[PDB]
Symmetry: C3
Subunit: 281 residues, 3 copies
């Protein structure tokens, strides 16, 4: 199923019939960082498998719902269960849920992820406001837009120089200052590793030389589809470890240690993003 105008429209039609919510904000939450979705008010939970033309996700299993409702007086739509390209999903499967968001009325997309630190000033537990990216799949002929262009959504050759909205970064930092946790908040360049193996010690050393501050396996595909169709983006990484320090000390990373960092920062990230949603212009 192609992520075209007709197919996205049929999914949006179903959603509008069931939910009655007209959202102008979308959210995609990272691994262990989804608590906010359980606090959406007057909410409606729609399993992906019920929505016409949504991608099949049963091989990977686990949760996959679209959730609509209100936060801070604002109308939102959330993806509960993100699609990752290391699972084997195609370009068309990644793009269709974002283009449905567009047809539903979304103008701002807020994204979180868990990532590895490269810049030496980053520690486990820090947040990074993403200000640009290095898209290794894109350079290597696996960009999320490879294929026919869907002209109704956007141009054949997008410019990404303003993909990460500057005023949204400034609002996120302002709220951290108001609540006295700005000492945790950095800005940086995100490198997209297709995955699913963690960056090796020598890949980490290479990324340091190339000007990368953070590395992870998500986010850049969704940012590109959003920018292509005119949706503004804020993207924030939670740092699980510093991979350069780990290479110097021969220390390993693993999914269990990552998720313990997520649990440590989940409630603060929930409070931060609730206020960001409330304060959006």
């Amino acid at each position: 199923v192609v992520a075209n105008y007709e197919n996205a429209s049929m999914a949006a039609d179903y959603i509008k019939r069931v939910s009655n919510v007209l959202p102008d904000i979308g959210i995609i939450c990272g691994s262990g960082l989804g608590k906010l979705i359980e606090e959406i008010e007057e909410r409606k939970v729609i399993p992906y498998i019920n929505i016409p033309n949504f991608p099949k996700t049963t091989v990977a299993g686990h949760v996959g719902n679209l959730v609509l409702g209100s936060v801070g007086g604002r109308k939102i739509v959330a993806m509960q269960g993100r699609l990752h390209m290391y699972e084997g999903y195609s370009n068309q499967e990644i793009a269709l849920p974002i283009r449905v968001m567009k047809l539903l009325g979304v103008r701002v997309l807020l994204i979180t992820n868990l990532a590895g630190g490269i810049n030496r000033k980053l520690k486990s537990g820090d947040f990074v406001l993403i200000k640009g990216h290095i898209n290794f799949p894109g350079l290597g002929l696996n960009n999320v837009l490879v294929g026919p262009n869907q002209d109704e959504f956007g141009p054949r050759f997008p410019d990404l120089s303003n993909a990460y909205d500057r005023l949204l970064q400034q609002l996120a930092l302002k709220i951290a200052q108001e609540n006295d946790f700005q000492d945790l908040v950095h800005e940086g360049v995100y490198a997209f590793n297709g995955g699913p193996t963690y960056e090796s010690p020598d890949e980490s050393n290479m990324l340091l030389k190339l000007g990368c501050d953070v590395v992870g396996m998500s986010t850049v595909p969704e940012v590109i589809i959003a920018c292509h169709c005119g949706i503004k983006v804020l993207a924030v990484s939670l740092i699980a470890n510093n991979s350069i320090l780990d290479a110097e000390n021969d220390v390993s990373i693993n999914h269990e240690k990552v998720l313990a960092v997520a649990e440590k920062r989940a409630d603060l990230l929930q409070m931060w993003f609730k206020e960001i949603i409330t304060r959006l212009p």
Copy 2:
């Protein structure tokens, strides 16, 4: 349809029946840089869709013709409507038209493209004679030769160290000197970005560190198929912008600005390549 000896032969048979031209020069012209094709003498226009085993191009649409005839007393074949890998074409679809050129008798392939400047001495409107490349799709398992080797055309493991003929570069520069526009002509290393998103500001900064002079989304696949089967190559980029300066000044690139640069330099590029064809040994 595989780009094998049998299938390429059937396409060449059709072409020979219709055109009567036996070319020894091939040309592939970049976006907005095709005016020379409209001035081929005693010419024959063959739509791709009529040629057995040529790739289907109707999803992308727009022009797609093979044009045979004479320029400067020399017999040539031109591709009018280039195939780009960001459209989703396979390795086999890109390679078959070049291998048909080989079977028709082509010994020299002349290529132009529109590209972004990385080296600080490059301005909008400059030309770059390409002397080597950095093939990010190739390093990343998307080389145009991934698949079975077609032994009749070339070896399993090609050497690319002489892919860009030195004497052809010298002839191009000599002609620019004769017509007093050598101040526009540089040489440089071409980085292949699969695309279709323009290089981001941080990708541009990375490419500067890695020794790239120019970046674009074409040309390297055709060069590799030509080198594999023994065809000599001249490749010239027209620079639309300097992406490093643009990142420093927060200025955007877009397809409209690119095509205005193409129109500005089209007639000079036409005159240059007409003389190159006339003067080839």
Copy 3:
């Protein structure tokens, strides 16, 4: 055919019925470096094409056998005819033979390859003990583990920091010292170029800047599948040329020169790996 638990089990069942050997060591030998397989004792040769669920290899042709028997009193299984990703094999086709090795009882995998030298201290004829890697296909969304995870074999997100066993490197070097050829033995970081074109002169210059010591077109996929399922690895490159010196002197590489280096070092590599097998803990 997916490289899952059921399918790997059916291949292992066939092999156990035919060979009676229960190996705990596996070997994969590089191009022109397979002489040791012809000296396996009380051996059993099983063509890939006879084994249920093994990948089809007739388009590429040439030898493809699994060979079981004894070396130095140890029980081994060898792949005679390696599968390379530049031939077009899928992730699932590369992984299934390694996962069959796991089910048969393999705990240690020994690998050799032919590679190009980047570090300036490497000469034609030198050996490199691989201590880490830079996986350009992996960064670019062509990692061998892209797809559903097969949970019975290993975790969704592997850590590769100990993929190249340190004690096995130390044993290999000790044996070289005992036989007075340690002057040929280096250690280094291996860059994976998907291929099949040799690294270009400008790609070589880039790899030097990025901390790569050696470059080649194999080995990293098998290492990752082995590490994922808990198999220890020793990987050794034989250097055919120095690509940085060749770029400075405008000298070419080709398959014929490569194989002459292989013949020059084949008998020493055979003796070295026989002793390594004998001495494994």
